[PDB]
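Record format v2
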Amino acid sequence: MSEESQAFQRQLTALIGYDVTDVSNVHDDELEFTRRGLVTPRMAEVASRDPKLYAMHPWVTSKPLPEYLWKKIANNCIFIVIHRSTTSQTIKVSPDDTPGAILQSFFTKMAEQDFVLRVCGRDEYLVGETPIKNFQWVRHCLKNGEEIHVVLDTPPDPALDEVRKEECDRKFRVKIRGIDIPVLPRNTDLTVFVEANIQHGQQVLCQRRTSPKPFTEEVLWNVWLEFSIKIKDLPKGALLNLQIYCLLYYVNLLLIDHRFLLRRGEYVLHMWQISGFNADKLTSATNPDKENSMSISILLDNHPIARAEMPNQLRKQLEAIIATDPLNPLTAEDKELLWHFRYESLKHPKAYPKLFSSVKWGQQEIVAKTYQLLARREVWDQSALDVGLTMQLLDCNFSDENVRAIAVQKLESLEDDDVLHYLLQLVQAVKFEPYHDSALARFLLKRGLRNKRIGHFLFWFLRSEIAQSRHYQQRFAVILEAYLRGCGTAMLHDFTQQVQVIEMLQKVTLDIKSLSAEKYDVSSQVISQLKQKLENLQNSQLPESFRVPYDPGLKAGALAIEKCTVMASKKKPLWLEFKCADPTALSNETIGIIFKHGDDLRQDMLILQILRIMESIWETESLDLCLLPYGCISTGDKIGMIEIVKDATTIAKIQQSTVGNTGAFKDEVLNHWLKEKSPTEEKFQAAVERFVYSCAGYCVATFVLGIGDRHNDNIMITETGNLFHIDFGHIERVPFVLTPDFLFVMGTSGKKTSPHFQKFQDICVKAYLALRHHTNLLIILFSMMLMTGMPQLTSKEDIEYIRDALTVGKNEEDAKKYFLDQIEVCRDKGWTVQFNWFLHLV
Ligand SMILES: CC(C)(O)C1CCN(Cc2ccc3nc(-c4cccc5n[nH]cc45)nc(N4CCOCC4)c3n2)CC1
């Protein structure tokens, strides 16, 4: 390539956090052929997008305005303020009006048509043929009782988005030669054997074993392991999972390559070790640690793919199977029904994952029948998109490329609004794809190229994985590189400014944590050399400003060094404040960010995403539970940034403020705090109403996810009454925190039913039922969260909680009770669970 084409790739590598052009950790050319493979879908999408709409990235929606927002417009008129520096005029607008209509009306109501309505303070433009009700920033102000401040400026130059130019009937067998490890020390002498499995989607097709020998650094066999499954019967996506028990080590090898050719030849595969099932266990990647890892030597030498109506009772049986939740196992009898009646099953889109779980993937004849069955997709295509359903077909239980492609097919109809909701979860599912190039990877690749907000989050999501996943970093980096070669030069510049800032902060953050000790503590010296380092950074060359990674409409400017400190936690996070880099911002207020090391913010990212999903469900049913899923982005390896919620305090501090003696908790204290932080009596009532809704929402959401038993410490509250949970980094009993300080705000001092307390029970039930109409979605979002989020879990046991919690297979009146009962446990326990929480530690 060109010299400047090489300067460009090293730019990409720094942005990616991994060198894709590197070839040290490969035993074929899947990754290279995938970089090549993704050139086309990147270029099709870059060619097709409107430059103007892409430059301005209008954030918008087709969902109807929820009821609670229609009661806020009882005049059928919405007010907009249009600013210019020396002046600004308010305009009454119809909810159906297009931004152009109001621009055209702003020239008339005065007493050259090349300007745009941008939001004051944010990189957010109101443009294109959509009614202003449909703009998400309009609905944001209508919900939180704010004004719609806008400024008439110049449309941004699409020139800045420039994309730089482009240039057998035999049975299967494997020969195990041996395993070698440099240093083996663990425990007194044990035995060691290899287990070879033919896998397709978490089903083992066939399994063989070696004879066990004593565990020492070299151990040979030279055995030919003869499987009963034939070569022709082998399906695309099939793995050869090789395992060492004494389970210590594992490695995998695809048996059909990306060119549909059977795998042949010699391979020495470096293997991953187990921590003293999960998505990592499926990876075609080999351990990059060639010096200290265990390896396996193997040999292949063996292309492929070259009327009647159902009776009444059996239909009842079938339909019953289809009705069961995703976590319900299928009997051999169950699977046989589903397959035999496959044409009737096909008529029910909710049967698809069960149906596709009844397929003998290890019989060519049956997979062909399955492909034939899939060609008459009339029912599936016409079905209304069910994100839950679609997700199930993307998990670890489906390796088939065509079964997964129908899933991605349905996704194509998601609007940007919705893709943003499931982006992270979708990114995590790439991990279940047998091959690097996949329908789904192309989908994320093209949806992000199409819209800058999806592109921005796509960037950070893929970049969190690359940084802390040797198992999938190579796959994910090939994809990030594909995206970055299409996003345009503004964004590359924008990402650079962002990466530079987090790298620069990463170094400060780590030295302070290390100079820092735990309990003690802080420590003036530490907080003084924090301000020293930061003043060193500003000049120079920390970026003049950068887009805020968890909120890319926001430009953070230079730091307010005096407002920056080191937090009072044993893990030493940096409380940073930045000046807003938009001078046309209507508020002087600073951008506050907590930069943390070395927790892993992936779990929080995930949880926060589910929470935003729950809010979106409630929005349909016209409910607003006042959740605060603040910004949280994993930026690198154990390094990430967190949005600071303005005027928020910890529930524990509000209790400690009264003399702070460990565990002595007083009921009246929270209501005392709120009333004190209230500018009027009016604002106090609003805070109580804000608390009743928020507390209600966190109660429901936190219970379903089984993260309800929390310390007072990780529950926070804004001075405006907004309660919100924090810190899922870590992950007697209580279902959720509903303590007597909370019940006193609502006006209850132990078994007394007040009007606010009645409200809480009401909203809870409404909120809990609304969630249950999405049981299948939640279950699947949660099953996936565990497999791609946590190091080792039970694919059986660990998930069930949510089945119980969601009250699967129970009528709405049993569910009303079931939750109202959980409320009574909270009131029964009182302060007891909170008391033990702080007690056991010292
Ligand atoms: C005075 C002093 C010592 O500087 C502080 C005292 C405490 N106070 C409130 C406080 C205390 C601890 C906090 N931990 C977190 C946090 C820590 C670890 C993992 C987390 N995942 N998600 C949030 C996490 N997040 C906070 N949020 C975020 C929301 O917006 C307000 C600050 C936060 N906030 C700030 C000033």
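The domain at 647-835 is CATH 1.10.1070.11 (Phosphatidylinositol 3-kinase Catalytic Subunit; Chain A, Domain 5).
The pocket of 0SD is lined by residues 565, 567-568, 575, 594, 604, 630, 642, 644-645, 648, 650, 726-727, 729 (CB under 6 Å).
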